[PDB]
Write a protein that binds this DNA or RNA. Structure first.
Ligand SMILES: [Mg+2]
Ligand SMILES: [Mg+2]
Ligand SMILES: [Mg+2]
Ligand SMILES: [Mg+2]
Ligand SMILES: [Mg+2]
Ligand SMILES: [Mg+2]
Ligand SMILES: [Mg+2]
Ligand SMILES: [Mg+2]
Ligand SMILES: [Mg+2]
Ligand SMILES: [Mg+2]
Ligand SMILES: [Mg+2]
Ligand SMILES: [Mg+2]
Ligand SMILES: [Mg+2]
Ligand SMILES: [Mg+2]
Ligand SMILES: [Mg+2]
Ligand SMILES: [Mg+2]
Ligand SMILES: [Mg+2]
Ligand SMILES: [Mg+2]
Ligand SMILES: [Mg+2]
Ligand SMILES: [Mg+2]
Ligand SMILES: [Mg+2]
Ligand SMILES: [Mg+2]
Ligand SMILES: [Mg+2]
Ligand SMILES: [Mg+2]
Ligand SMILES: [Mg+2]
Ligand SMILES: [Mg+2]
Ligand SMILES: [Mg+2]
Ligand SMILES: [Mg+2]
Ligand SMILES: [Mg+2]
Ligand SMILES: [Mg+2]
Ligand SMILES: [Mg+2]
Ligand SMILES: [Mg+2]
Ligand SMILES: [Mg+2]
Ligand SMILES: [Mg+2]
Ligand SMILES: [Mg+2]
Ligand SMILES: [Mg+2]
Ligand SMILES: [Mg+2]
Ligand SMILES: [Mg+2]
Ligand SMILES: [Mg+2]
Ligand SMILES: [Mg+2]
Ligand SMILES: [Mg+2]
Ligand SMILES: [Mg+2]
Ligand SMILES: [Mg+2]
Ligand SMILES: [Mg+2]
Ligand SMILES: [Mg+2]
Ligand SMILES: [Mg+2]
Ligand SMILES: [Mg+2]
Ligand SMILES: [Mg+2]
Ligand SMILES: [Mg+2]
Ligand SMILES: [Mg+2]
Ligand SMILES: [Mg+2]
Ligand SMILES: [Mg+2]
Ligand SMILES: [Mg+2]
Ligand SMILES: [Mg+2]
Ligand SMILES: [Mg+2]
Ligand SMILES: [Mg+2]
Ligand SMILES: [Mg+2]
Ligand SMILES: [Mg+2]
Ligand SMILES: [Mg+2]
Ligand SMILES: [Mg+2]
Ligand SMILES: [Mg+2]
Ligand SMILES: [Mg+2]
Ligand SMILES: [Mg+2]
Ligand SMILES: [Mg+2]
Ligand SMILES: [Mg+2]
Lengths: 147, 210
RNA sequence: CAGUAACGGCGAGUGAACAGGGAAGAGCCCAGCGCCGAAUCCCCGCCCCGCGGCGGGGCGCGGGACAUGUGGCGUACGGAAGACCCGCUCCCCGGCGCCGCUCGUGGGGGGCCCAAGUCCUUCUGAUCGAGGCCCAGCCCGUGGACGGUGUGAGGCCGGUAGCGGCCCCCGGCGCGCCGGGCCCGGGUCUUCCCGGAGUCGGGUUGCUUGGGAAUGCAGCCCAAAGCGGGUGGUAAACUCCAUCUAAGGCUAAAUACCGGCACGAGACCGAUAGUCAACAAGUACCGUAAGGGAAAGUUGAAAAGAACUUUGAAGAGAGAGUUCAAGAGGGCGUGAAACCGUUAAGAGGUAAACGGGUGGGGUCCGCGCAGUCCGCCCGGAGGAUUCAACCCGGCGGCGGGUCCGGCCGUGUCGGCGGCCCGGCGGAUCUUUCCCGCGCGGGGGACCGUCCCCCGACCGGCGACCGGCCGCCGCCGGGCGCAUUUCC
RNA sequence: CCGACCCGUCUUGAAACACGGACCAAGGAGUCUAACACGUGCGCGAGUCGGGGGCUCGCACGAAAGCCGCCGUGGCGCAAUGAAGGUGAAGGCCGGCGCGCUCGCCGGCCGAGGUGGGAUCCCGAGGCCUCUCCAGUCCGCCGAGGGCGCACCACCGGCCCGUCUCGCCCGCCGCGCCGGGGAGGUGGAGCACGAGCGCACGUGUUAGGACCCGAAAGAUGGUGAACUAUGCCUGGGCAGGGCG
RNA sequence: ACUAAUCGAACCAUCUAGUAGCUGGUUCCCUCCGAAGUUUCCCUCAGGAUAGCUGGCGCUCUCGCAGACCCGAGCCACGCA
RNA sequence: AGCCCGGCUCGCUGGCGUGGAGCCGGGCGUGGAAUGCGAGUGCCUAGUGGGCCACUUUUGGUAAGCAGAACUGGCGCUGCG
RNA sequence: CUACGCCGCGACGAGUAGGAGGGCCGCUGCGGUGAGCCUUGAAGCCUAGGGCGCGGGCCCGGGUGGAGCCGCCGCAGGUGCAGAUCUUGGUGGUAGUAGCAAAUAUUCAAACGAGAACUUUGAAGGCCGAAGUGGAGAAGGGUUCCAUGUGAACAGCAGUUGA
RNA sequence: CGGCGGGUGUUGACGCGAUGUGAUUUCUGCCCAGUGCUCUGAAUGUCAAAGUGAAGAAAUUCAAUGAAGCGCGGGUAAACG
RNA sequence: CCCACUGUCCCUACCUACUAUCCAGCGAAACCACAGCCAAGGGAACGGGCUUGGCGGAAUCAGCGGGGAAAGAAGACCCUG
RNA sequence: CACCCACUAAUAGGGAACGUGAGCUGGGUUUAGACCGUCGUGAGACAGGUUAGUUUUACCCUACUGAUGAUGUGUUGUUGC
């Protein structure tokens, strides 16, 4: 809605909100990111440090699919199965532990943030972190690897 | 000019973009035209499935998608050969064929040939001359049982094998997943240089006494 | 994917691809290597069947092309030839007659048609306006889009709706026949045969790319191989692996469309706007030329476009006339401002103009000109149903242990109640009853939400409602006809 | 009668001998797209979003609206850090043990620590009552103190990744130039019970004609020797006298 | 000098709405708040960035909200200048 | 967030139960000058970045309605006597 | 007591550049709504008419006009002008002014005619003076040539004349 | 732009082309250090690509060789001066 | 520089033609914030307007060149970009 | 400015946008042509010399110069202050 804008209020004021002295000119200071090392250097150094220069090794033909490896944390681990699964495992008389396939749920690596409920569980994952494995073993579970 | 905090922006509008602007006001018309073409084609091939030939079960290539499975271009010649279908008759009876696809493993081969056999079982074949049924099908199962199929023929569906909860054994409890992964990475990294060092040690060993 | 990998005085800036999901989906042909008595093709004469894009068949000791290579088989998905076994499986071409009538309901093109007020009274210059049209209401409505008509019209007219009608023409779909072609397909084994060269590749140069020790293209020089060659995004050597098979060719669909033909529409513009162009506009006109390039819409419903008389040489006037209107008179709808003429009023030697404050004059306004109203009461002089209270009927409001139901919310029981005779889901267990190798799909059990139910207990009649009572209020009809009530 | 210089504009300063403005009418200048940032409104919420496609008499409206759910592919968010190989965010108490050696083996609990502030909430001795009293019935207000403490702030601890320094253990189908662990500093756009996603609006910045008008220039492709400059071809023309 | 009234590089159309830190203009009303010409850096000195000065949006708290008319019944807020 | 009592921890320090720092309980309100005022905190942000003048201090200059600084106020942005 | 309402008390009020809020200020179009207005007169325009609002502006009376228009709730803009040596169009003062002064020159009578300084005829006085103000062509123009008629406009006065 | 393309040139040193000075008369002095121009390659220094050799597994590296030009050596002022 | 010659001058005058001038007819343009009498003051430091004073009388004609820092051109000098 | 000649009573000094260019003139400076000297490799430069080089408009307002008139005395005239 153009009726809600400053232009409808700036009618009758000669400079249209841009001042009488400095005016509104075409491009004072340059176009785009002009002078980022010369006369906009303070702004660039203050708000975008690291902007200039090269760091690291370049790699031609990067394929994101090769490095595709989504992660899941242990605190969200039990959300990958049904509530029926967890309650049945908790109230199970036998020590049978449910299997959670994070690769089926769409995760390749299991990370160790959080804590697990005190009940055994088998976890199928491509990769495990050390603390995730430790915390799974703590509740009497097992970590099994898949390809 | 930059003004206080902000993101360094790089618009790609330096190249006279307004001569090449594709508006989409003909998008509803295009959808209507495509729907009309689909309906006309379905009417043209009256009892044949509207979507077209059956497609093979095909696993997606990269490591990002190899857990998923989808529909391929056509059945491979090895699949047709072990399913007993001629590669020139399959297209006539509505089976897509892909002469340039190979079968690296046997499981995908067997899955696709069971797919072909199931399709062949479900296929109703009309004789060329309706008054002279030579070898296609009985008229009883093609009078009223013939019906144009809507959607893909035998749509490819991802299947998950459910594992029942079981008792964890001591061997599974004593398996060290993180240590195994780290050692596997190290072994794959150092396999070649270990072989070279062993070769050099053997060279010294076979002449150490002289 | 992705403003990412990458390129970039690594500055400004630039910048893809793979995988994934869709739209569409279609595959093939030569050369070569070979086999087949050149099996091949063009042209010209003759005959017949046809014309509608010039074809078919036959004939010619008729010509020519062609062994410096035509045609058939055959092409990397291998192919050919022999045997052995099995299956006869059925192709396309142009007509004769007619269906299902081609099909979201005609397949297309063209032509002609199809509902209902000009009803009564009125407005007007004219009306399409206003009021009405007893039977639930003028009539039609599958038609109330639009346009025209002297306004503003569903019913006056054209149209509009309709798997509405009729007529003419054209095109493709099945059957029986017609003229002729049309030649064997698969599996196993054996024996053979298999490929594109001044091209790849390499050096250099220039351009190009995101391609970075060089992505692609090209010039010049060098110049291949056949378990070879290309690619495997960092130059190179060795090595393994993966992947394809270049230097020959064709191919629909999905896609693009500011020109063209024919349409439809719009929260667009409304004659200095919108195309330059609403109009005899790429016109008039300008420039030697290339080229530049306007301005310009509106009388009235109908010309009914002013007969006739009169002054003037005429332009132009005064009358008269048409019209609802010429205070609409052929650049004529309306007709602003700037500016000008005249009339009326006022004023005027510090240029006008302006702010504040009064005063005078003037044009108008106030139904100004004997000045409001209205509640109660008192007094006077008149009317009239009827005032109150009771009776009958109707209708409301409120309350009621739920008086009686209908129920409502939350739980609570047996599940009689549902995988046959109620659903939907579960990353929950199973044939240890059922069809695929000890390896699937079904069917079951359980669980979670359920569903309507048989009923009960808790809270409540709630703003979810009824019936009975009780109270109150209003209204209508009686009686009440005078110290009441009202005007 | 008193007061009163002409506006706009640049400017320290305009009535200026500073510029524009004779008058009137109509037109006339911060827009749209994209991308950000923050604020506000709405929906859903560890999710969110169908925008591309598809399905629905194909179409007056409708090119709309509705629906998809094994169309959620994908985008953004839910994890950071390192050039990279890679790695990747849970602690507090009561104990029995080596030797509880500043540490290794387990149990039982609980589940992101603590200090100082901290809206709000909770308890609360004691007060406020009537015609009065000895004697307790029910609840209302004030209330010194005390308690649990939201968000947020300051600080101290802890955890993840990089990198240094020190040092000792542990693991094995590969005993290795193998793998893992500790303590103490330090670098990080981190964790420490999520807050995002989509849509709309406003403001600000930027790329685009970019609020409107304005160069001297540069480039590409054409038209001109009817004027003039020069060469060529073919024509025409230039009284009367003097010197000699 | 001349090259069609144009010559220290003609004319025409197009790129082209070329760019401009420079000049000019920039359209309704009321209310509230209300500046700077200074610091640092810049081939910077007629310009920018940066801090300062401004506005807007808030948010976190403090004094209590007193008696229905009325009537207080040593000690009188976090913090700031 | 002060003062004063005890107690605990330390791998720092060290004749020492030493020093220092931290931590844990407890008790102290006459709130430890005057005066005034309600404070704290975050985000976004325009314009500006030519100034000029006066008292006083002050540099260059013979001086300047000159040029340059300090302090406060003003004009700019402000009418009124 | 339109709670987006109403009421009370206290203090305060300058403003460029700039920022913000409110607008029952204004323009155009769209979705709703007013059983809205209108040929018994819409829009527009004019007005010594009556008023309202601080203001932007608005309402009503009178006239002209002759067919459409507006309020409210939302939505959307090519939405408000005194300037830009602004664009287009129109109009003033200047001003009945500058001016209608290069190349010697006209006069008399008559005719036609409404009308004669300018036309025609006659008479007179002059000029070009054969390198012409004469007679004919090229280029260029394109019907200007010739006759008749007209007196709108044009021939910078006029015209009975005219390219 | 290009073609063994075209102008001088239907030409040939009494000719074409490029300069300076400016009739006649009388003269036109000194300077080759500088910058130009030009002649000579003499052992010759430097010197690119290609080619040659060596090392390496190759990329690559090194070495040898050595065109013009430049240096080295003459001439030239009616060349600039 | 000299002779001659003369209105170049002392030192101006007179005459002629065409204008200007007045009239009939016809009829522009430049320019224009508003306009138009001065002295001094102050002021962007040279006012038509403001302050203080001097003063001010319709409508005009022919001239004139003191002013309007007159008009004509976004200064060509100088500086900046 | 200067200097000289001669006369004279004396041959004083100055201002008025260094009075006065829509008053003139255009000799000088100060465009474009050209020559010399100096400077510069050069283009070119020189408060160095020299030569040739377009001087536009008033009809507006005021001022001034003249020329009709205007207000009042009833009209009008003469003579006057
Ligand atoms: Mg303002
Ligand atoms: Mg303005
Ligand atoms: Mg710099
Ligand atoms: Mg992204
Ligand atoms: Mg590019
Ligand atoms: Mg598809
Ligand atoms: Mg052959
Ligand atoms: Mg009809
Ligand atoms: Mg009509
Ligand atoms: Mg109609
Ligand atoms: Mg029809
Ligand atoms: Mg590599
Ligand atoms: Mg137009
Ligand atoms: Mg109009
Ligand atoms: Mg006339
Ligand atoms: Mg009329
Ligand atoms: Mg008219
Ligand atoms: Mg008048
Ligand atoms: Mg200005
Ligand atoms: Mg100044
Ligand atoms: Mg001013
Ligand atoms: Mg002045
Ligand atoms: Mg000036
Ligand atoms: Mg200026
Ligand atoms: Mg002007
Ligand atoms: Mg103007
Ligand atoms: Mg306007
Ligand atoms: Mg849709
Ligand atoms: Mg996904
Ligand atoms: Mg806390
Ligand atoms: Mg900390
Ligand atoms: Mg910002
Ligand atoms: Mg522009
Ligand atoms: Mg250039
Ligand atoms: Mg010529
Ligand atoms: Mg331009
Ligand atoms: Mg300026
Ligand atoms: Mg400035
Ligand atoms: Mg100063
Ligand atoms: Mg200022
Ligand atoms: Mg101030
Ligand atoms: Mg003041
Ligand atoms: Mg104010
Ligand atoms: Mg506009
Ligand atoms: Mg205007
Ligand atoms: Mg005159
Ligand atoms: Mg004259
Ligand atoms: Mg003569
Ligand atoms: Mg002649
Ligand atoms: Mg003639
Ligand atoms: Mg005339
Ligand atoms: Mg010569
Ligand atoms: Mg000499
Ligand atoms: Mg050499
Ligand atoms: Mg010599
Ligand atoms: Mg004066
Ligand atoms: Mg200028
Ligand atoms: Mg200029
Ligand atoms: Mg002077
Ligand atoms: Mg003068
Ligand atoms: Mg002059
Ligand atoms: Mg001169
Ligand atoms: Mg000169
Ligand atoms: Mg001369
Ligand atoms: Mg005159």
């Amino acid at each position: 809605p153009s009726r809600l804008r400053k232009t409808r209020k700036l009618r009758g004021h000669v400079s249209h909100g841009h001042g009488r002295i400095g005016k509104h000119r075409k491009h004072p200071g340059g176009r785009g990111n002009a002078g980022g090392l010369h006369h906009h250097r303070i702004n660039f150094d203050k708000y975008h440090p690291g902007y200039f220069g090269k760091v690291g090794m370049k790699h031609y033909h990067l394929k994101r699919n090769q490095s595709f490896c989504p992660t899941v944390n242990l605190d969200k681990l039990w959300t990958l199965v049904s509530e029926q699964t967890r309650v049945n495992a908790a109230k199970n008389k036998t020590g049978a532990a449910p299997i959670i396939d994070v690769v089926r749920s769409g995760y390749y690596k299991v990370l160790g943030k959080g804590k697990l409920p005190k009940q055994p569980v088998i976890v199928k994952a491509k990769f495990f972190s050390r603390r995730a494995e430790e915390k799974i073993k703590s509740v009497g579970g097992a970590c099994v690897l898949v390809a | 000019a930059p003004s206080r905090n902000g993101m360094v922006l790089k618009p790609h509008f330096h190249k006279d973009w307004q001569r090449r602007v594709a508006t989409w006001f003909n998008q509803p018309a295009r959808k209507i035209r495509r729907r009309k073409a689909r309906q006309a084609k379905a009417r043209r091939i009256a009892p044949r499935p509207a979507s077209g030939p059956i497609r093979p079960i095909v696993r997606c290539p990269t490591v990002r998608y190899h857990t998923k499975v989808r529909a391929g271009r056509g059945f491979s010649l090895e699949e047709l050969r072990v399913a007993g279908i001629h590669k020139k008759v399959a297209r006539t009876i509505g089976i897509s064929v892909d002469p340039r696809r190979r079968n690296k493993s046997t499981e995908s081969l067997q899955a696709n040939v069971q797919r072909l056999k199931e399709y062949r079982s479900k296929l109703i074949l009309f004789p060329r001359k309706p008054s002279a049924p030579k070898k296609g099908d009985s008229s009883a199962e093609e009078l009223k049982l013939a019906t144009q199929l809507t959607g893909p023929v035998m749509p490819v569906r991802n299947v998950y094998k459910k594992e029942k909860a079981r008792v964890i054994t001591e061997e599974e409890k004593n398996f060290k997943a993180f240590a195994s992964l780290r050692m596997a990475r190290a072994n794959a990294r150092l396999f070649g240089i270990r072989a070279k060092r062993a070769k050099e040690a053997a060279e010294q060993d076979v002449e150490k006494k002289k």
